[PDB]
Design an enzyme around this catalytic site. Structure first.
Site, mmCIF file in Angstrom:
data_model
loop_
_atom_site.group_PDB
_atom_site.id
_atom_site.type_symbol
_atom_site.label_atom_id
_atom_site.label_comp_id
_atom_site.label_asym_id
_atom_site.label_seq_id
_atom_site.Cartn_x
_atom_site.Cartn_y
_atom_site.Cartn_z
ATOM 1 N N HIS B 41 0.702 -1.184 -0.046
ATOM 2 C CA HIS B 41 0.337 0.130 -0.003
ATOM 3 C C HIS B 41 0.679 1.297 -0.236
ATOM 4 O O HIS B 41 0.206 2.478 0.239
ATOM 5 C CB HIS B 41 -0.909 0.146 1.362
ATOM 6 N N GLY B 143 3.119 5.970 9.711
ATOM 7 C CA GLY B 143 4.028 5.857 9.284
ATOM 8 C C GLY B 143 4.978 4.694 9.676
ATOM 9 O O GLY B 143 5.785 4.206 9.108
ATOM 10 N N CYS B 145 3.889 1.503 9.506
ATOM 11 C CA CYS B 145 3.921 0.632 8.825
ATOM 12 C C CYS B 145 5.029 -0.271 7.997
ATOM 13 O O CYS B 145 5.450 1.163 7.673
ATOM 14 C CB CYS B 145 3.042 0.999 7.480
#
EC number: 3.4.19.12
Lengths: 305, 301
Positions: B41, B143, B145
């Site tokens: 993503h 952030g 991730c």
């Protein structure tokens, strides 16, 4: 985006963990440049611990009396001296992983990370806090002696703790990287015991702000309190008395949330006298006292190393 | 003595954290050998995240579309591919800090260390458990991730988790290192919520032995119990049912303390029914379940 008692990344420190053995005695050493630090009681054994004359035991030691192992490589010790409770070993190789670092003596209530080691082997890392009574409620098995405590600023590792001993109560005592013990503790087998502990009030307050920052604020009220009345209540529940200094260290946080420190004390006060009533704060059923005011800004700013 | 919720030393993982940017999206990635792993993503923005189509999204991208950096230094991506909910990017440099590793899919109730990262830079490390409902009760700002959960056995890093997203209730969801989501979630802005979270009975019993081993045993009692009877109470309180497999696993710790597993279940039945009475166990005011029995034996011997 919850909240977690986080340790610093232990990478820079792992690189400095070695093994130090003297006869049958094996523990951990701190390898920074061409020096290895470790607890001097590494030259002891059973009998020795009961009233040791470290100076006279050290005299009977040659440089070959020590074996130093970084990984599977042996480090040649070429010099040895004593600095307070630490042994300093001089090795023929400057640790290629030496990080930017420094030695600091922390204060009671202050937190840091501990890299637990055995045979020179980093086994795990956790946060803890120097107890008001100068002990760490840590988790150490045999041969953990030598494991260190540290914090991190940007580039620089700040070493602040080396582990020497376990007290009768299962709590833990050690030194700063200068060889001075924290508290009145000595590295002998004597009848020394941890005095009564108290709750780090400064750290409870910081934690309470944390909750509020994270939108968890059911416990806030409309009143305030004086520093005196607050200390009259807290000391019943075995809290460190709060000082004007403490109040100022909470400065940034009270500003961030716009909640004044004595206004937040009022909230603590009702949480103490009235308890939590099956409610939680940041998912906890009890109040937390091992986050410092700086830990909270740190974690709440996504600070990085 | 003592009992802390330890993480594994994060050093080995630190050396494979990188930053991956695409358009105006930036997240962390894992750099092992000549390959960089991150959540797919990273190629989404605004619109996309609400019902995207990662197939059409990727075809429209080149190697050139990904800015990858180990620190200030850009790494040349010479290849990309999608693997389930991951993106894999081939780079022109091998990673010298790449450790002995393997990709494993853990099971709810098991524990791991997370290295929380931002911009490819470590913030901190902590131990947690994979919940029965497949979420983790994490600490992940914007952030984070692409940060990873791992275990370390000997010299060898076992990666089990890469962080992908946060649910409405503020809990977290992710995948193993092969791209498959733990639990029924998707990487799309949608109306997905976490299933019912239950306590990890097996871990709690382990932690009660950890309390016994460490001298804390006010909660013990004369009674014993049957497995069925314990489960009839334990289930009342949103606790996972307990199995023979579970009891067997607890063997070594019962043999360590004397206390029979079923006696400990009887103690646990009392706690559930009476609360803790203002007292604590290993300093805790609520039963703790992010410790596995393997975790307890290791920390306690």
């Amino acid at each position: 985006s919850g909240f977690r008692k986080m340790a610093f990344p232990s990478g820079k420190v792992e690189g400095c963990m070695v093994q130090v053995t003297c006869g049958t005695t094996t523990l951990n050493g701190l390898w920074l440049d061409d020096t290895v630090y470790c607890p001097r009681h590494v030259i002891c054994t059973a009998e020795d611990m009961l009233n040791p004359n470290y100076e006279d035991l050290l005299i009977r030691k040659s440089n070959h009396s020590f074996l130093v192992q970084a990984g599977n490589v042996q480090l040649r010790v070429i010099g040895h001296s004593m600095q307070n409770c630490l042994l300093r070993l001089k090795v023929d190789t400057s640790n290629p992983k030496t990080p930017k670092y420094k030695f600091v003596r922390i204060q009671p209530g202050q937190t840091f990370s501990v890299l637990a080691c055995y045979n020179g082997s980093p086994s795990g890392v956790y946060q803890c806090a120097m107890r008001p009574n100068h002990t760490i409620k840590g988790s150490f098995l045999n041969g953990s002696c030598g494991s260190v405590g540290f914090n991190i600023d940007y580039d620089c590792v700040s070493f602040c703790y080396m582990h020497h001993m376990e007290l009768p109560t299962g709590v833990h005592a050690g030194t700063d990287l200068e060889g001075k013990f924290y508290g009145p503790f000595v590295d002998r087998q004597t009848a020394q015991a941890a005095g009564t502990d108290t709750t780090i009030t400064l750290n409870v307050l910081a934690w309470l702000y944390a909750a509020v920052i994270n939108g968890d604020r059911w416990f806030l009220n409309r009143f305030t309190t004086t520093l005196n009345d607050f200390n009259l209540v807290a000391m019943k529940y075995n809290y460190e008395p709060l000082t004007q200094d403490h109040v100022d260290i909470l400065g940034p946080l009270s500003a961030q949330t716009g909640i004044a420190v004595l206004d937040m004390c009022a909230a603590l006060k009702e949480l103490l006298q009235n308890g939590m009533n099956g409610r939680t704060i940041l998912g906890a059923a009890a109040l937390e006292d091992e986050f410092t005011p700086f830990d909270v800004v740190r974690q709440c700013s996504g600070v990085t190393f």
